[model samples]
Target: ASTDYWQNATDGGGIVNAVNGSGGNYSVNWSNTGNFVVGKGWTTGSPFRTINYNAGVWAPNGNGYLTLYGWTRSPLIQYYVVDSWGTYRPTGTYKGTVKSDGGTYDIYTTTRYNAPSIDGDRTTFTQYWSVRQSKRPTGSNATITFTNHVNAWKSHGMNLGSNWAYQVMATEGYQSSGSSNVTVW
Candidate 1:
């Protein structure tokens, strides 16, 4: 098949989601009843990732807490480790537990893109999907915390590291969102 077909599948036509079975143009073509029985190489049909949000109760005084959820951009991998194409790289590594403004969380760095921010404080647990699918699956919990600074608009905090990522080159933190310009798989 020409490269245009696959490119069109992603761009305009879109890939079929066989894992979740939501129904699409394509269904899973499994070899057996085993692992990744969908397409050939590097196709996100069988192993679709998922992210679960874990936001529990507040401290009663309305203090913000940590929100936990699993993100499966890459099969059996964390969210940050996912590349812009949603592909997995082997060099993703976790250094240690680090402290942040809110609390302490896991610190990791990938060979490719930047890392994600993880905090177990507000979050309880995360669940990763065995495969990727057509639908964009994100973590369950999303939190938007508002803090007051001397110049809230002028200054912003960023997360340069402290999560799983690919193994390629150094990553940069975006000044606007504090997130990496590199897309997570």
Candidate 2:
């Protein structure tokens, strides 16, 4: 880590696919009477369970279906999991069902080092931006807005008039908003 490793600091390592597999369920769906097989992660061809992250994207186990719900990495994975489920299929882009946390989030794509500044290294390969409902639009018909609430050290540059394109994984719904717990494994 070069001199005991400084910079950000991460607990997870390597390329671990978030949502793997195909059209199978991981939670429970009462609408169509379809339930999920909780406990283990999505398997071969099984759809992804609802796991929110403020940093990276969810890798689909199926053909090109992926949802990238990022989380704040470093020392731990910081994100919440709403205690509910919905009928959301990965659109290869950022798209997810609303959780019960009353907050909305997405897996935005950005550089840990920004560009040509190179930092984070092992600490933060990718970073996530998160916030409470106050920062997110509460109106159902209101337009979604993006805010720069992430740490400056993990950032490379500013949006600077459309230099980046941000997409959302999920929006407002009853099943949205998840449990607020941090895991270091």
Candidate that would win on lDDT: 2
lDDT of 2 by residue, 1-185 (tens): 00111112112232221231122212211111111111221111111223332312222222111121223212222222221122342222232223233554432333333221122234433333332322332212222122222222125231222122222232112222221111110
User: How accurate locally is residue 79 in candidate 2, as Cα lDDT from 0 to 100?
Assistant: 23
TM-score of model 1 (CA atoms): 0.19
Residue 112, candidate 1: C-alpha displacement in angstroms: 3.9
| Candidate models: Cα lDDT each | 0.21, 0.23
Tell how far residue 38 is off in model 1, in angstroms.
19
TM-score of each: 0.19, 0.20
RMSD of each: 18.2, 16.7
Model 2: runs farther than 4 Å from truth?
1-124, 133-139, 147-166, 171-185
Best by TM-score: 2
Q: Candidate 1 local accuracy as lDDT?
A: 0.21
Candidate 1: tens digits of C-alpha lDDT, residues 1-185: 11011111111122222322111112221111211112111122111222122212111111111121122222223222211112221222444432222333333333322322223123222222111112122222321121211112113221222333322111211111111111111
